[PDB]
């Protein structure tokens, strides 16, 4: 309660930094990309056979 | 009942937002 | 009392790699010609072990 405004400002700045970090070309979502990439290579090999 | 047993004291009643005025019983 | 006990857990296992043409055919060129008819089997097995 005595430090409510500091905590509010730190929360807002952390949310903003997450927002820019997702914007500026991140590979942090790469774990969701592999689930797409591993399946497409599985179906390209079936068609090649 | 609000008593000194189940409350604890810290600071002044300026920085807290939403603070009120009420009596506190002292068990003596 | 103070008791000290042991838990034993596996984390990893041995890596390995297989040469598909060397296992199946060896140094033969005639065998290497006939292995091409079966498709892309060696690339898949190497990719999986990798
Ligand atoms: C609660 O919110 C109302 C409306 O925003 C405001 O008038 C009031 O002062 C607030 N009370 C406290 C304790 O913050
Ligand atoms: C609590 O008492 C003080 C004493 O003067 C007064 O200034 C303040 O306005 C009171 N608070 C409320 C919410 O009435």
From Swiss-Prot, chain A:
Region (Heptad repeat 1): 4-49
Source domain of life: Viruses
Purpose of the protein: Acts as a viral fusion peptide which is unmasked following S2 cleavage occurring upon virus endocytosis.
Protein's UniProt name: Spike protein S2'
Boundaries of the shown chain within the full protein: 899 to 947 of 1255
């Amino acid at each position: 309660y005595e430090n409510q405004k500091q905590i509010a400002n730190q929360f807002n700045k952390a949310i903003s930094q997450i927002q820019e970090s997702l914007t500026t070309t991140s590979t942090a979502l790469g774990k969701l990309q592999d689930v797409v990439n591993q399946n497409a290579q599985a179906l390209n090999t079936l068609v090649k056979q | 009942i609000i008593t000194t047993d189940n409350t604890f004291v810290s600071g002044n009643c300026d920085v807290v937002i939403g603070i009120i005025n009420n009596t506190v019983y002292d068990p003596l | 009392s103070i008791s000290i006990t042991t838990e034993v857990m596996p984390v990893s296992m041995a890596k390995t790699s297989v040469d598909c043409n060397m296992y199946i055919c060896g140094d033969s060129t005639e065998c290497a010609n006939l292995l091409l008819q079966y498709g892309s089997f060696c690339t898949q097995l190497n990719r999986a072990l990798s």
